[PDB]
Design a protein around this ligand. Sequence first.
Ligand SMILES: CO[C@H]1O[C@H](COS(=O)(=O)O)[C@@H](O[C@@H]2O[C@@H](C(=O)O)[C@@H](O[C@H]3O[C@H](COS(=O)(=O)O)[C@@H](O[C@@H]4O[C@H](C(=O)O)[C@@H](O[C@H]5O[C@H](COS(=O)(=O)O)[C@@H](O)[C@H](O)[C@H]5NS(=O)(=O)O)[C@H](O)[C@H]4O)[C@H](OS(=O)(=O)O)[C@H]3NS(=O)(=O)O)[C@H](O)[C@H]2OS(=O)(=O)O)[C@H](O)[C@H]1NS(=O)(=O)O
Ligand SMILES: CO[C@H]1O[C@H](COS(=O)(=O)O)[C@@H](O[C@@H]2O[C@@H](C(=O)O)[C@@H](O[C@H]3O[C@H](COS(=O)(=O)O)[C@@H](O[C@@H]4O[C@H](C(=O)O)[C@@H](O[C@H]5O[C@H](COS(=O)(=O)O)[C@@H](O)[C@H](O)[C@H]5NS(=O)(=O)O)[C@H](O)[C@H]4O)[C@H](OS(=O)(=O)O)[C@H]3NS(=O)(=O)O)[C@H](O)[C@H]2OS(=O)(=O)O)[C@H](O)[C@H]1NS(=O)(=O)O
Ligand SMILES: CO[C@H]1O[C@H](COS(=O)(=O)O)[C@@H](O[C@@H]2O[C@@H](C(=O)O)[C@@H](O[C@H]3O[C@H](COS(=O)(=O)O)[C@@H](O[C@@H]4O[C@H](C(=O)O)[C@@H](O[C@H]5O[C@H](COS(=O)(=O)O)[C@@H](O)[C@H](O)[C@H]5NS(=O)(=O)O)[C@H](O)[C@H]4O)[C@H](OS(=O)(=O)O)[C@H]3NS(=O)(=O)O)[C@H](O)[C@H]2OS(=O)(=O)O)[C@H](O)[C@H]1NS(=O)(=O)O
Lengths: 207, 517, 517
Amino acid sequence: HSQSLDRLMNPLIDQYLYYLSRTQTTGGTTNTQTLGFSQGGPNTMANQAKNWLPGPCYRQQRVSKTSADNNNSEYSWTGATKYHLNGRDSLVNPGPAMASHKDDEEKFFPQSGVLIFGKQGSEKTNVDIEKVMITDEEEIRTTNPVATEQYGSVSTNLQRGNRQAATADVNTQGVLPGMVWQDRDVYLQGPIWAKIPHTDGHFHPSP
Amino acid sequence: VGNSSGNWHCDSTWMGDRVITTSTRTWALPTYNNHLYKQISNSTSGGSSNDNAYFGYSTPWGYFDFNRFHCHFSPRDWQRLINNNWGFRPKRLSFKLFNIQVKEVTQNEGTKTIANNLTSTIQVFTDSEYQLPYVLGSAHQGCLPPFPADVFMIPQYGYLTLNNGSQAVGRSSFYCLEYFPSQMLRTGNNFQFTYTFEDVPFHSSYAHSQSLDRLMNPLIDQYLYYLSRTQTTGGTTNTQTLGFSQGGPNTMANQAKNWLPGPCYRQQRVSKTSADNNNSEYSWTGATKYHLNGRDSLVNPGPAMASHKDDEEKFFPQSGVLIFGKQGSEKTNVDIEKVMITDEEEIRTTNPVATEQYGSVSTNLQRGNRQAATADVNTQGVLPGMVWQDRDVYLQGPIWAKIPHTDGHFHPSPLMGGFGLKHPPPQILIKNTPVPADPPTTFNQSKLNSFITQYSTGQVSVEIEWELQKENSKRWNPEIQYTSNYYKSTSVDFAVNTEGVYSEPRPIGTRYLTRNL
Amino acid sequence: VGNSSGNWHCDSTWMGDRVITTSTRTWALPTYNNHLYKQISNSTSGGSSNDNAYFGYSTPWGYFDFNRFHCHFSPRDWQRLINNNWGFRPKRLSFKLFNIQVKEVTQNEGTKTIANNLTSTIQVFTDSEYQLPYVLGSAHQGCLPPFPADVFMIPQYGYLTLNNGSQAVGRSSFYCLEYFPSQMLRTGNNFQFTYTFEDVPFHSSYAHSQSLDRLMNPLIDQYLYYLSRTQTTGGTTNTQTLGFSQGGPNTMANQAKNWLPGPCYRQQRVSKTSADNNNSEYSWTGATKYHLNGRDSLVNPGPAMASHKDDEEKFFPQSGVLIFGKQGSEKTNVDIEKVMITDEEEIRTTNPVATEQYGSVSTNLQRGNRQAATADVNTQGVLPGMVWQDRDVYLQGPIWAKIPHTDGHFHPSPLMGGFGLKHPPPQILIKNTPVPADPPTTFNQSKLNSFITQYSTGQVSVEIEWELQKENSKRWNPEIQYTSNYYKSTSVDFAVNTEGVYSEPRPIGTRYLTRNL
Ligand SMILES: CO[C@H]1O[C@H](COS(=O)(=O)O)[C@@H](O[C@@H]2O[C@@H](C(=O)O)[C@@H](O[C@H]3O[C@H](COS(=O)(=O)O)[C@@H](O[C@@H]4O[C@H](C(=O)O)[C@@H](O[C@H]5O[C@H](COS(=O)(=O)O)[C@@H](O)[C@H](O)[C@H]5NS(=O)(=O)O)[C@H](O)[C@H]4O)[C@H](OS(=O)(=O)O)[C@H]3NS(=O)(=O)O)[C@H](O)[C@H]2OS(=O)(=O)O)[C@H](O)[C@H]1NS(=O)(=O)O
Ligand SMILES: CO[C@H]1O[C@H](COS(=O)(=O)O)[C@@H](O[C@@H]2O[C@@H](C(=O)O)[C@@H](O[C@H]3O[C@H](COS(=O)(=O)O)[C@@H](O[C@@H]4O[C@H](C(=O)O)[C@@H](O[C@H]5O[C@H](COS(=O)(=O)O)[C@@H](O)[C@H](O)[C@H]5NS(=O)(=O)O)[C@H](O)[C@H]4O)[C@H](OS(=O)(=O)O)[C@H]3NS(=O)(=O)O)[C@H](O)[C@H]2OS(=O)(=O)O)[C@H](O)[C@H]1NS(=O)(=O)O
Ligand SMILES: CO[C@H]1O[C@H](COS(=O)(=O)O)[C@@H](O[C@@H]2O[C@@H](C(=O)O)[C@@H](O[C@H]3O[C@H](COS(=O)(=O)O)[C@@H](O[C@@H]4O[C@H](C(=O)O)[C@@H](O[C@H]5O[C@H](COS(=O)(=O)O)[C@@H](O)[C@H](O)[C@H]5NS(=O)(=O)O)[C@H](O)[C@H]4O)[C@H](OS(=O)(=O)O)[C@H]3NS(=O)(=O)O)[C@H](O)[C@H]2OS(=O)(=O)O)[C@H](O)[C@H]1NS(=O)(=O)O
């Protein structure tokens, strides 16, 4: 896509919709509680009102292709994202569809969130990184969230005179009405099809 | 030149099962960017943070935007639709542009002279193939005004592309609008265009009269048991046990249910009385906001959720509502008596409150020594068995939005309300064709930058046929209708004041009539 | 007067085997020479040398020139044609002129007033008989701009004849353009004209993947011998002998061939890094230049030849290439970062390098005492058995050229690239018809020299149908496509900058796809 899902507006016009812009009178010496509303505009593109949301997420661990940038521990299995089924854990790999990295971060790839092919004649076990070809799912950063970052932030309490506004990071986010996402790419070396399991329930049965 | 191109049709027709709302207005189109496509970025608009960074293009084209309910329905027609129908959806649209005049303003010696140029044209095309960035549905300004008496100016079309800060990436595209087949129109020519909406679900313009967690028979018990008691009650030494009870008319909360409330993405709860809010700047810090490609954006209005619980009108979710602005209200840091905050409380029956946890889930495995722990669910994606209602519509709010061309979308109903369409009414783009001033008498390879100053005006009609779904309520007592309060006021509501300024006093939704769940 | 004459069509249509590229633009025509035919010569332009001497006439007529590939193809369309087709040629053309306005500027008291004159006309004729000097194909300026958003002014038509210095010879002819049947057009009238191209060879838009001197089987030897050894090798006293070897996979240079490289006319080799060039003014002295009737002219770009050998991008033939200029680049002594020098290196397979000898030939008869001498062939005309490729096309370069009406022409393909045509699209000439100011009230035999100042504007469309020759490559590995580099830039390529100025960053040729020889 040539447009980002969060930049589908007209950059010359403002909106006719307001948003909580200011909560505290700015200065005096004694700035107090207030409520100011602004109209989304070409300068506040982040605060504007949107009709859609990014595709679903299941956060992944972010490893660097340069081993000097990674923590010195064996987290290949410990720090991995893995579903539980009938008492046993399995690696979510490649997992659902998500962008590999943000802008200007080619060196980083989600731990399991990508398809890793092997160069010709590459061995089977503990082969090094110059013996494999790690795919780059970065062309879907427009609709899908980055595999190695929180999906969003949600309010975790009720702010009041004494209690202040707390918020949490959303690592796993199932679909919601209004979401839109793209599916994983295909790869001339990758699979073509997969049988949709014979179950009585399947959501968006794309492999 | 000496013959009108069309007539003024601006009234609604009710045919029982459908209503055709026509609306004519007078517009004015100036020459934008002085006929140039200029590249714009957050740095040209005076720089910004990374969350507000952008890269797009301004074009010399204006565009017509009739994507608001008040451009079509009058406050009376809207009330006649809201009090009698259970649902409605648009069926076909018919846009017409006529009575075009291309005036040529020549400012010489402080004295302004405006004369009509009968030979000048305007180009107007409609992207029926959706090959251009769709800008409508972002709730921008520049709509046919709500009051038919006034004339509006046509907004400028500009689009955005991919960016990496204020810079352009490889995939950033440049679309020349002059590369599409426009239709030159002199005074005397008219533009007609028809469109028929795809099959979209009716907008549920009713509230439910039953709560999703009270759909039982209050006189009968269930034949299903539930863990009622876990500890022998008293003795002195109450110990571990297991008692099961049958759900009944007194334990309505413990009974067994077949359905669950709609999905949630928790919001921060602010009070309309600023003395009840924490004294900090949490407009951006305490907000719920999705992350996309490294930059955060406000979830606003976000997905569909109830505004507050029972008897708490003062509280509203920070972003979870549509906030319109009263007439003439400014643009920045306007106070709360200058806006109209909508109340999405009629969906507390199926949708969870925007400012409260969705549920509680067990976080461990209770045992002899470990005791039962539980967590609060702030964000909850859909699950088999969920049921929810979509956001209301608001006679001042949007009508439709283009469903993004992706290969995956769940329940593509727009979060701002309206009808999600894969092929929405196309964008009608229009500009004044350039008319060069006298060129040199010797050839210069350089493009001509001197133009005759002009702007065009004329009328525009937009007829939309809506399908209705009449209310067949078999209820006994009277319902809740939208009514203008009978008390005497200084000025009538939805009318012009003593200065000729039309104003809509409050935001009117559709959910008035009730229906069972 | 109050009705448009045409619409704005400016898009391409791909039908598999052909592509129809339409392109509408807005023009402006001033009154040239104040409606007079003036005789011009090198002496009126400020005198010159004998090589630059000329004698011609200026006329009050302007002419339309759409002889450039960028007037028809957009950078995207050109890429879709360059990456998928092996050849292309034009089939039919359809020129249309409409929405004409004849404004009348009256400058009184420093205040300029421009009003439309509805009764004024313009004359426009097309020389379909080629009775006028053909001026298009000389790569002049005044083309429909490449970007459709901008308006251009129409160039002035003037022609040259025979001369003897700044003077006219007996055969010098004077052509009055008013002596042809024009077509007066008021506002409201339009000019339509159709043309169908003769049968011209497809333009080979592919590179060869094999070198003309490596078309053998590298595993087999030949059954043909060649003089391999002439002197018994060592002893101490090596003497005269005659040894013959068979060409083989190791002596690929000595093998026998059926073909020869295309013709040559050697060029001087200059380096893009001025520190590598001799410190002298050899722009004219060291140039290759043909002699004609006593005066020298630069062979530029000259016939078709490769620019450099392998791994020598820095070097380019002095005249042997097309040098375009970046946007806004000046006219005189502009530096090398202000131009874009094309690279004709994809034809090193068949054509000899422009800056090297063609071959070596024996210049004497070796004997017992005289030894074998040889010379370097700088200029080599065609010979039976030669094969060569023609110069590339360049989305900014010319499309066609009229083949001169002579009784002898060899391989009439234009040296600047394009399609050589004997009957090229005719020249559409257009001028504003004179409108005299108020004449005396008493008869004066003298022609009226006072005219109403006016200029005309309007739109012009040009539709061309091109026949394509789809690529059927049975190659296994991927080819070389033209692609916009994926890295992030400040501004998109082939797009408008932040000031609305469209610019083509580099010269795009056609030879991307490869094919065997
Ligand atoms: C960890 O638990 C411990 O801390 C949490 C909070 O901290 S935390 O978030 O960091 O974890 C405590 O939980 C919060 O507070 C609870 C509590 O204080 O009981 C409870 O608050 C909600 O309900 C409270 C009582 O409501 S009531 O309807 O049942 O009475 C309420 O506080 C009461 O406010 C009312 C009020 O303002 O109206 C007071 O009533 C008084 O005025 C009324 C109207 O006034 S008027 O002028 O006459 O018009 C009169 O009608 C009434 O007669 C009068 N009562 S009187 O006795 O003073 O005369 C009442 O006195 C207050 O107790 C909370 O409202 S608030 O006003 O305090 O802001 C209300 N929540 S809120 O409105 O959303 O703020 C909640 O469970 C919880 O709320 S919270 O805001 O989300 O945090 C927890 O209790 C505490 N437990 S502990 O660890 O065991 O110590
Ligand atoms: C933070 O980590 C630390 O604390 C957590 C818990 O605390 S927390 O929740 O607050 O964070 C610890 O994690 C919990 O406990 C773990 C543990 O104790 O190892 C582990 O428990 C699960 O597995 C245990 C061992 O199972 S086994 O199949 O591998 O052996 C188990 O405890 C064992 O119970 C069995 C049993 O009851 O059967 C005992 O076996 C004995 O009886 C068997 C049958 O008896 S019979 O009469 O002969 O029929 C015999 O066959 C067997 O031979 C005999 N063994 S013997 O050596 O005593 O002779 C066995 O001894 C016990 O160790 C847990 O069951 S339980 O019985 O203890 O309740 C079982 N989980 S459970 O059944 O669901 O309760 C889990 O990882 C975890 O469980 S939890 O309940 O979810 O909490 C963590 O280990 C601890 N680590 S630390 O921080 O590093 O110190
Ligand atoms: C710049 O000019 C000067 O130098 C050039 C050459 O130098 S350069 O190339 O660097 O510029 C001279 O030009 C070359 O030489 C010319 C020349 O020597 O006259 C001339 O040579 C060609 O013709 C010569 C005469 O031919 S003839 O048929 O007219 O007689 C010839 O030399 C003669 O060779 C014959 C021969 O070998 O047959 C000799 O004849 C003798 O034998 C014959 C057969 O023998 S057999 O055993 O009986 O069977 C007998 O029949 C004959 O009776 C007998 N004659 S006898 O008098 O000795 O008894 C004859 O004597 C020779 O003169 C050249 O052949 S060659 O044998 O010398 O190799 C022949 N060219 S060749 O055969 O292709 O080599 C040419 O014009 C030219 O030739 S070249 O090889 O291309 O260079 C130039 O003359 C000189 N002029 S100057 O500057 O004014 O001093």
